[PDB]
């Protein structure tokens, strides 16, 4: 019944929802060296 604000909207499932729990999801946006 709750409304979804535009900024709160999600179009895609989480990488966990799409790859299972036996895969580690790495998001390396920033450098480490």
């Amino acid at each position: 019944n709750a409304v979804v604000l535009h900024e709160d909207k999600q179009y895609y499932p989480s990488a966990e929802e799409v790859y299972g729990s036996n895969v580690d999801i790495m998001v390396q946006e920033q450098d480490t060296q």
Binding site: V3, V4, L5, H6, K9
Partner: protein, 97 residues
């Protein structure tokens, strides 16, 4: 295209460019991207209904009504044909334009 737009806009914001052409190109790209986002936002608004709930709207209307009646606000009327100040308001608007 979007990555180049981001990079060029950041460069322009810092101040590292003096091209008129690069500034105009990036202004065009930013306008296109913003308009895409705005069209998506309006479409989402139509899809997802009024973000402000019925209860919130009722509460806001009630508070505004109470506030206006507390200060005895006399609602603005439609300007009659015999309004003394029409010419003056008209000339003021014309000068501002």
């Amino acid at each position: 295209w979007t990555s180049v737009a981001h990079f060029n806009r950041e460069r322009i914001r810092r101040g590292a460019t003096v091209d008129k052409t690069v500034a105009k190109k990036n202004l065009g790209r930013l306008t296109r991207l913003w308009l895409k986002a705005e069209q998506e936002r309006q479409h989402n608004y139509l899809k997802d209904g009024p973000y402000v709930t019925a209860d919130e709207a009722v509460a806001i209307y009630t508070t505004f009504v109470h506030w206006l009646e507390s200060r005895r606000f006399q609602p603005i009327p439609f300007p009659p044909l015999s309004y003394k100040h029409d010419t003056k308001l008209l000339v003021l608007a014309l000068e501002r334009l």
